[PDB]
Short mmCIF file of C-alpha atoms and ligand atoms in Angstrom, two decimals:
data_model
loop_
_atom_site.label_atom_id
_atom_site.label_comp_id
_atom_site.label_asym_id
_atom_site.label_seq_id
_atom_site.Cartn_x
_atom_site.Cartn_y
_atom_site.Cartn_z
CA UNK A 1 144.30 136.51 71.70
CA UNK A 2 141.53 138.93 73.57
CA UNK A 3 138.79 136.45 77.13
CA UNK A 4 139.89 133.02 75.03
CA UNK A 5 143.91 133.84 73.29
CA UNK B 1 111.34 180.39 99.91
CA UNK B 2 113.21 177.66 96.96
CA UNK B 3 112.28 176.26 93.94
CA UNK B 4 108.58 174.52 94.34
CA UNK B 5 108.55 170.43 94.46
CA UNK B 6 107.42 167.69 92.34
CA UNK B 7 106.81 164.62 92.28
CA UNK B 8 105.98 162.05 89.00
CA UNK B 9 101.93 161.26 88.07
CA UNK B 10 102.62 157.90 87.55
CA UNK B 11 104.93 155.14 89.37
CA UNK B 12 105.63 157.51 92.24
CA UNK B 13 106.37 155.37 95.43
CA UNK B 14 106.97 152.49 93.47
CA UNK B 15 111.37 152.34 94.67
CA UNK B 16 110.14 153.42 98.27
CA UNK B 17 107.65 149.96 98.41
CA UNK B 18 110.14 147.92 97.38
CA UNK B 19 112.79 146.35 100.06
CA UNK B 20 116.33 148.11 99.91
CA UNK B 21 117.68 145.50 98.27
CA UNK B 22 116.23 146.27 94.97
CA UNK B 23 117.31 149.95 95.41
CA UNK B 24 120.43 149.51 96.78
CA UNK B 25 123.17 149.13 94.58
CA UNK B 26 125.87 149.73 96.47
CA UNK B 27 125.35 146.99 98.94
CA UNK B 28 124.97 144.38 95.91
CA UNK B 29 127.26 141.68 95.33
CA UNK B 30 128.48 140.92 92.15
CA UNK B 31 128.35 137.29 90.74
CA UNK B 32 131.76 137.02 88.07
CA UNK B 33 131.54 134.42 85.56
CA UNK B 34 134.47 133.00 83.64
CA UNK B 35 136.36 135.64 81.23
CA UNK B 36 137.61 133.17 79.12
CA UNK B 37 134.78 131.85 78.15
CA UNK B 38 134.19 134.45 75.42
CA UNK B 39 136.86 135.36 72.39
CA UNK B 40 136.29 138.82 70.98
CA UNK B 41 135.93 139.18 67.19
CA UNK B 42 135.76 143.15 66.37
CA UNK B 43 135.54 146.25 67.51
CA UNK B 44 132.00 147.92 67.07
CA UNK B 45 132.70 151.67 68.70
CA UNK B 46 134.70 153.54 71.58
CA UNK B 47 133.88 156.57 72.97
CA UNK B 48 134.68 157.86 76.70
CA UNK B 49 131.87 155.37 77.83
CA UNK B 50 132.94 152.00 77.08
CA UNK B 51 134.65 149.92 74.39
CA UNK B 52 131.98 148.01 73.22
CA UNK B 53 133.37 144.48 71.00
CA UNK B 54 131.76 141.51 69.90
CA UNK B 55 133.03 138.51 71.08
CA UNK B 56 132.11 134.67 70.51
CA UNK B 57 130.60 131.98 72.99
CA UNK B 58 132.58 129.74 72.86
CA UNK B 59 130.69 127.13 75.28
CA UNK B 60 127.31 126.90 73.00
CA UNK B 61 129.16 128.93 69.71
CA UNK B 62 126.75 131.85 70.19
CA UNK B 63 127.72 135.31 69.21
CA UNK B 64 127.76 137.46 72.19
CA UNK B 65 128.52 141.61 72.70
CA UNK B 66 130.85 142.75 75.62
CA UNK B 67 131.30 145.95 77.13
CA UNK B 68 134.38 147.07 78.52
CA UNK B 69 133.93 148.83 81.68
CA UNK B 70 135.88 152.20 81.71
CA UNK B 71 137.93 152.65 85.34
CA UNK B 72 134.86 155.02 86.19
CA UNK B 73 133.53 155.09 90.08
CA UNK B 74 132.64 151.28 91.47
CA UNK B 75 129.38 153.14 92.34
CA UNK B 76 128.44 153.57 88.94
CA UNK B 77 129.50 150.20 87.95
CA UNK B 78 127.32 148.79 90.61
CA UNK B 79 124.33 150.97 89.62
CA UNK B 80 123.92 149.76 85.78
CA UNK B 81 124.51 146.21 87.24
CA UNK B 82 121.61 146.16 89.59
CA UNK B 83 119.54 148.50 87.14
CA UNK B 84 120.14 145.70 84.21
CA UNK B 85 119.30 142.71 86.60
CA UNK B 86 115.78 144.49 88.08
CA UNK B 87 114.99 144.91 84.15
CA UNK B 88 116.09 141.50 82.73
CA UNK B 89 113.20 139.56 80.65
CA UNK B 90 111.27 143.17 80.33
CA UNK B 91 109.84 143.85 77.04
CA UNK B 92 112.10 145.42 74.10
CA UNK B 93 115.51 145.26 77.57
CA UNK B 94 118.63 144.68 76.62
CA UNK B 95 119.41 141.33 78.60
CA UNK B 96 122.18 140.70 80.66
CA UNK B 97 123.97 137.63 79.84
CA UNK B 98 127.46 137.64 81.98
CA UNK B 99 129.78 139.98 83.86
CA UNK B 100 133.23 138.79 83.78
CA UNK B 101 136.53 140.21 85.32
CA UNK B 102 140.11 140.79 83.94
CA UNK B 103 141.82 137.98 85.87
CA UNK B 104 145.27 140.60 85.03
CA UNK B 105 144.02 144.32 85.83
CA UNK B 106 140.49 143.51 87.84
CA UNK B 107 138.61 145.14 84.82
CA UNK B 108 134.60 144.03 84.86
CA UNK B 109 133.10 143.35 81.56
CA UNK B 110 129.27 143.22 80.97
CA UNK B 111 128.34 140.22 78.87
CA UNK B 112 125.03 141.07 76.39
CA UNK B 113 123.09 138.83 74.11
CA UNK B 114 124.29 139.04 70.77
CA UNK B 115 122.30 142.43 69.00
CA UNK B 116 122.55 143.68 65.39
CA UNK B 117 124.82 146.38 65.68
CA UNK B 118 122.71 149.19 63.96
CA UNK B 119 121.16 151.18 66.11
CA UNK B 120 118.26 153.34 65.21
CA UNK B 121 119.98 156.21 64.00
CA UNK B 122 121.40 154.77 61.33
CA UNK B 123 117.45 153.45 59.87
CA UNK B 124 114.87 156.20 61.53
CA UNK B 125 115.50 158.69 58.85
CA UNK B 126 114.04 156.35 56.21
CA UNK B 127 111.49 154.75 57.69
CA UNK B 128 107.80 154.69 56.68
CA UNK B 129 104.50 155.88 58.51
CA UNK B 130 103.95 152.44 59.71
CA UNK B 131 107.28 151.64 60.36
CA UNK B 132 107.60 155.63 62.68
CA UNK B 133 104.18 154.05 64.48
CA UNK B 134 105.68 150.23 64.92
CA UNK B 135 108.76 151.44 66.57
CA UNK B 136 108.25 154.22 68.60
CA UNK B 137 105.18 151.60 70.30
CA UNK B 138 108.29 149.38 70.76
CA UNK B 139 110.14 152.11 72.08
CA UNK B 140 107.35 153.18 74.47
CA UNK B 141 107.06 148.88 76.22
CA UNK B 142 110.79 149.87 77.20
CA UNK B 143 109.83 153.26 78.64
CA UNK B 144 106.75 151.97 80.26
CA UNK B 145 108.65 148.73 81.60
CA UNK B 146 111.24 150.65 83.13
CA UNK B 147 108.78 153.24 84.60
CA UNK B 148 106.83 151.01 86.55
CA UNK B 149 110.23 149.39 87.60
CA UNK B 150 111.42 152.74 89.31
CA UNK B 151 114.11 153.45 86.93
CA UNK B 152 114.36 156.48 84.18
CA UNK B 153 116.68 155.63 81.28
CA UNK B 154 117.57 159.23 81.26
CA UNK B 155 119.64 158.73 77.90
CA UNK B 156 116.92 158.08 75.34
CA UNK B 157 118.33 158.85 71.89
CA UNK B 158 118.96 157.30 68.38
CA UNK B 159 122.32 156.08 69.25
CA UNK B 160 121.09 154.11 72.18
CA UNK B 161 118.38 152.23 70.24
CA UNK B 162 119.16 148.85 68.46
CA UNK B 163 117.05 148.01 65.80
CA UNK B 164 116.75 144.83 63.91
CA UNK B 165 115.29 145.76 60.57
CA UNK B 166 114.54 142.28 58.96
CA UNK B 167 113.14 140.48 62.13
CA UNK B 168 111.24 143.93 63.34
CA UNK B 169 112.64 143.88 66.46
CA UNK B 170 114.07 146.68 68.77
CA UNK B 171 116.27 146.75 72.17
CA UNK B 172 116.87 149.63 74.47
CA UNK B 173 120.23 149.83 75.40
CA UNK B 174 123.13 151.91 77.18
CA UNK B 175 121.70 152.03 80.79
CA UNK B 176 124.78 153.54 81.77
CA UNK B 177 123.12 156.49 83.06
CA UNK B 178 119.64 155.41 84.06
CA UNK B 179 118.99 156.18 87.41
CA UNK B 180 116.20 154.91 90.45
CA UNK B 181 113.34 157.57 90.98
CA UNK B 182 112.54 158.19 94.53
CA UNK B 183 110.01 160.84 95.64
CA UNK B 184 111.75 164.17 96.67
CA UNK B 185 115.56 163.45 95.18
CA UNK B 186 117.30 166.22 93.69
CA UNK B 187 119.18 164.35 90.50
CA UNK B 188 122.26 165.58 88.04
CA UNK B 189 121.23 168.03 85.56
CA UNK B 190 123.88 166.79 83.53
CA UNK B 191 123.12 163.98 81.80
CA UNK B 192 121.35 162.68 78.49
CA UNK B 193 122.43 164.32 75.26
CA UNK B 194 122.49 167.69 74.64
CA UNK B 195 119.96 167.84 71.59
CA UNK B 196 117.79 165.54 74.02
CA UNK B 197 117.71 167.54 77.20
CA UNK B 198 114.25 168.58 78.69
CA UNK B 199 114.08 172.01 79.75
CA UNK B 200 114.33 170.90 83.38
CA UNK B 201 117.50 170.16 82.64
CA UNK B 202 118.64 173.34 81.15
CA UNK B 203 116.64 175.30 83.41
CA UNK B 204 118.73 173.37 86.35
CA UNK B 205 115.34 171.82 87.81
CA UNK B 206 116.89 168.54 89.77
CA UNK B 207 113.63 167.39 91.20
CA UNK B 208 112.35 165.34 87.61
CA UNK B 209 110.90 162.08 87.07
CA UNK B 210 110.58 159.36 84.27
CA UNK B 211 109.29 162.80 82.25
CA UNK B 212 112.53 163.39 80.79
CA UNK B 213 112.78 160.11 78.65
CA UNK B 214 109.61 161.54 77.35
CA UNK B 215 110.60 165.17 76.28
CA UNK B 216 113.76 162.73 74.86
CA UNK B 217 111.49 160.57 72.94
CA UNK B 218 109.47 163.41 71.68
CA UNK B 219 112.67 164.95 70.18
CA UNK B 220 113.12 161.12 67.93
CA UNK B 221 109.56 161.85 66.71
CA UNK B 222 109.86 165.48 65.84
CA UNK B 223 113.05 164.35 64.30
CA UNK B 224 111.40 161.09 62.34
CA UNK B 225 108.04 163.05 60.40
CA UNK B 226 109.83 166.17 59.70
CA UNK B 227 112.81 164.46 58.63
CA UNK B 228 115.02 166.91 60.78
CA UNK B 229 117.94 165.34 62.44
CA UNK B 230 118.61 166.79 65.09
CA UNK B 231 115.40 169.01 65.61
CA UNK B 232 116.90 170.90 68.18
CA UNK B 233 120.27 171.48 66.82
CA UNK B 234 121.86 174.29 69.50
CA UNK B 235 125.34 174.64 69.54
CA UNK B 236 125.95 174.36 73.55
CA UNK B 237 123.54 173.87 76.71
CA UNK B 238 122.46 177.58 76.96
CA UNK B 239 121.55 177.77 73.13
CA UNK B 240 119.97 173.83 73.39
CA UNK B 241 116.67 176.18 75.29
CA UNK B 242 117.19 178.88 73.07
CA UNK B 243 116.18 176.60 70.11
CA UNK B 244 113.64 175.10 72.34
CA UNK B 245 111.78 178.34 72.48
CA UNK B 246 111.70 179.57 69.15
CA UNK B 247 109.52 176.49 68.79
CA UNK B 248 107.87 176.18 71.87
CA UNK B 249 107.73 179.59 72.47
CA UNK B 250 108.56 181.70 75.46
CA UNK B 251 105.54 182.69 77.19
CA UNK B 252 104.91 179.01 78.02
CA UNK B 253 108.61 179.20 79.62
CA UNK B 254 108.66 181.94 81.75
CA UNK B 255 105.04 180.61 83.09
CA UNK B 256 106.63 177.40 83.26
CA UNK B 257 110.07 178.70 85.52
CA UNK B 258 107.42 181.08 87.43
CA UNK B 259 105.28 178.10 88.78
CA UNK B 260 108.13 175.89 90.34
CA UNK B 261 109.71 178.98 91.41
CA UNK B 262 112.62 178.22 89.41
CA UNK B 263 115.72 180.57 89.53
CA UNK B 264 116.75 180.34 86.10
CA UNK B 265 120.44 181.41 85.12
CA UNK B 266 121.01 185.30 84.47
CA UNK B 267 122.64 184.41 81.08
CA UNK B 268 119.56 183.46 79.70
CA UNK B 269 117.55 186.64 79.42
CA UNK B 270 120.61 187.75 77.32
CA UNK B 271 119.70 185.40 74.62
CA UNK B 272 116.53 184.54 75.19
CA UNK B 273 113.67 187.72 74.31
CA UNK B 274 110.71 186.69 73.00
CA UNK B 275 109.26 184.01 70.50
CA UNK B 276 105.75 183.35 69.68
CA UNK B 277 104.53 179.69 69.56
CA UNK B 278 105.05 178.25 65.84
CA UNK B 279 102.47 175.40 64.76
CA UNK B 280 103.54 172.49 63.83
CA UNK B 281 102.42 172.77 60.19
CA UNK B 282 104.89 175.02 59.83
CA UNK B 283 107.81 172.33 59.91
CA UNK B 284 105.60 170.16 57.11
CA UNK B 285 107.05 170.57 53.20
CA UNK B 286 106.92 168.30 50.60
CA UNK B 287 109.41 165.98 51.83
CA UNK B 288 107.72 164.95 55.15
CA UNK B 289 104.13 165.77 54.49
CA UNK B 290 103.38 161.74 53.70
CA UNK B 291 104.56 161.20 57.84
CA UNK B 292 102.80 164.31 59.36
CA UNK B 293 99.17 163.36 60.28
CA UNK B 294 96.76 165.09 62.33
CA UNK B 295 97.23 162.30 65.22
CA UNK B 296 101.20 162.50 64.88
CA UNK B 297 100.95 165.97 65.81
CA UNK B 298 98.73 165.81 68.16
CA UNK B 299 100.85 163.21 69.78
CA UNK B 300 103.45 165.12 69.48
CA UNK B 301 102.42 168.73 70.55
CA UNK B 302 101.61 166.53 74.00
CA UNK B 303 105.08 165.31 74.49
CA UNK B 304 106.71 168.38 73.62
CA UNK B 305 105.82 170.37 76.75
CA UNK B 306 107.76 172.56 79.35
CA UNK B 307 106.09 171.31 82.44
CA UNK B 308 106.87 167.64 82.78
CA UNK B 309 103.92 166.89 84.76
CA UNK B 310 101.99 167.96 81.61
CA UNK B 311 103.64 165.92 79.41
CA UNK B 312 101.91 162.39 78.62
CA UNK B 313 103.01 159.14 80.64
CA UNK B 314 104.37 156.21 78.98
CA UNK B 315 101.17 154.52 79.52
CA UNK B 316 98.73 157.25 78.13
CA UNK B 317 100.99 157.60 74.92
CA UNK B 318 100.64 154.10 74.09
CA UNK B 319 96.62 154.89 74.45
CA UNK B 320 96.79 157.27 71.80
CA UNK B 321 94.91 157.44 68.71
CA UNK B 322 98.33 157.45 67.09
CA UNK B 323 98.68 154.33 67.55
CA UNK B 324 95.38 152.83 66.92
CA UNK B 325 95.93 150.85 63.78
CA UNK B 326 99.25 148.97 65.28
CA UNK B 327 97.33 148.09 68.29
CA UNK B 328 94.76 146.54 65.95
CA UNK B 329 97.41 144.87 64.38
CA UNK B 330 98.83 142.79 67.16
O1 NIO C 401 124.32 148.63 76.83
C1 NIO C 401 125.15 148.92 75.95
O2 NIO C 401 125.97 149.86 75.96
C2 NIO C 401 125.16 148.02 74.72
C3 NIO C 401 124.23 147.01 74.54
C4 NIO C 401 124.27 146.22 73.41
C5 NIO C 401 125.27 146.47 72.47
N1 NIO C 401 126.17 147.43 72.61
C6 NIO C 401 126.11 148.18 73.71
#
């Protein structure tokens, strides 16, 4: 979820 | 006729040397890497700096710390880039792993290898006499590195210290506000922390040098074998001096304003008057007596000076006989 989900 | 110059002992025409490239932040190009590379885990603290998480690696599963760039001045940005890159593989650095961008709202993010998040503020109040000796040597290869790079940290305090404890290891970090010394410049008063500030600083003298991380690191040792945190605890800017000379005292200030032909602010000779010079016995009770040492304050009484240019280098503190039985040691 926060860079990568 | 002005304020009189100055110029640093050591590492003085070291930026002026080098080609502009090194000094030049503003013309340097950033390289991005890939953003989605990393997956952040937790917060680990905010402030109107940064928002500093740790994130995951997910290429080679190693844990990694990111920074989160505030929408500050692309000058700055550039400045603490450059400034981290010049210094990467130094001794006790903070390395620069990545920078990344937001591929939504354009926001860079700085990319660090993966650091125990306690810093040494929450460890140097119980540390040993050993331990005070091992770490402020640590802290001094950073200093020293940095020096004879051309840059001043200009921020040294507990908070911007990591420590690893277990593996005795220690990173400087937060070079958010270090700057590149060149011969003649006229800097910002305004920066370090407030219980760190040299009295160039509050005396508004904008010609310093890599002195001022020393007065800083001076302050972690006074606060360390007296066990006094802060040791100069004044409640604004003006009374930050004002605490500095009831320990200092003020003869040695008004000789020290008097030879750079400083024009010090009006306000202070309201609250300043006069203070006599207290030893430094005098801040020894049963409590810290086992960390005060005839070399310790000795050490310290020559890092604790008004006049920068009197204060001792980076490289002559680590010469010290303070230090003697950790040189031994390695
Ligand atoms: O440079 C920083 O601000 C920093 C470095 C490591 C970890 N947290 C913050």
């Amino acid at each position: 979820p926060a860079x990568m989900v | 006729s002005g304020p009189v110059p100055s110029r640093a002992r050591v590492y003085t025409d070291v930026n002026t040397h080098r080609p502009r490239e090194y000094w030049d932040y503003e013309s340097h190009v950033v390289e991005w890497g890939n953003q989605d590379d990393y997956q952040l885990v937790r917060k680990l603290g905010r402030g109107k700096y940064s928002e500093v998480f740790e994130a995951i690696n997910i290429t080679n599963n190693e844990k990694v710390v990111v920074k989160i760039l505030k929408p500050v001045k692309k000058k700055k940005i550039k400045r603490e880039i450059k400034i981290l890159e010049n210094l990467r593989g130094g001794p006790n650095i903070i390395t620069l792993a990545d920078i990344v961008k937001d591929p939504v709202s354009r926001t860079p993010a700085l990319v660090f290898e993966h650091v125990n998040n306690t810093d040494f503020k929450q460890l140097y109040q119980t540390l040993t006499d050993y331990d005070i000796r091992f770490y402020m040597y640590e802290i001094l290869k950073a200093l020293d590195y940095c020096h004879s790079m051309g840059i001043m940290h200009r921020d040294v305090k507990p908070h911007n210290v990591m420590i690893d404890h277990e593996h005795r290891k220690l990173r400087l970090i937060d070079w958010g506000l270090a700057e590149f010394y060149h011969p003649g410049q006229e800097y910002n008063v305004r920066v370090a922390s407030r219980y760190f500030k040299g009295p160039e600083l509050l005396v508004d003298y904008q010609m310093y040098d890599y002195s001022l991380d020393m007065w800083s690191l001076g302050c972690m040792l006074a606060s360390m074998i007296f066990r006094k945190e802060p040791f100069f605890h004044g409640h604004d800017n003006y009374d930050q001096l004002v605490r500095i000379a009831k320990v200092l005292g003020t003869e040695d200030l008004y000789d020290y304003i008097d030879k750079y032909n400083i024009e010090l602010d009006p306000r202070f000779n309201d609250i300043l008057g006069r203070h006599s010079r207290k030893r430094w016995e005098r801040f020894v009770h049963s409590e810290n007596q086992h960390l005060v040492s005839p070399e310790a304050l000795d050490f310290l009484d020559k890092l604790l000076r008004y006049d920068h240019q009197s204060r001792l280098t980076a490289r002559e503190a680590m010469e010290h006989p303070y230090f003697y039985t950790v040189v031994k040691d390695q």
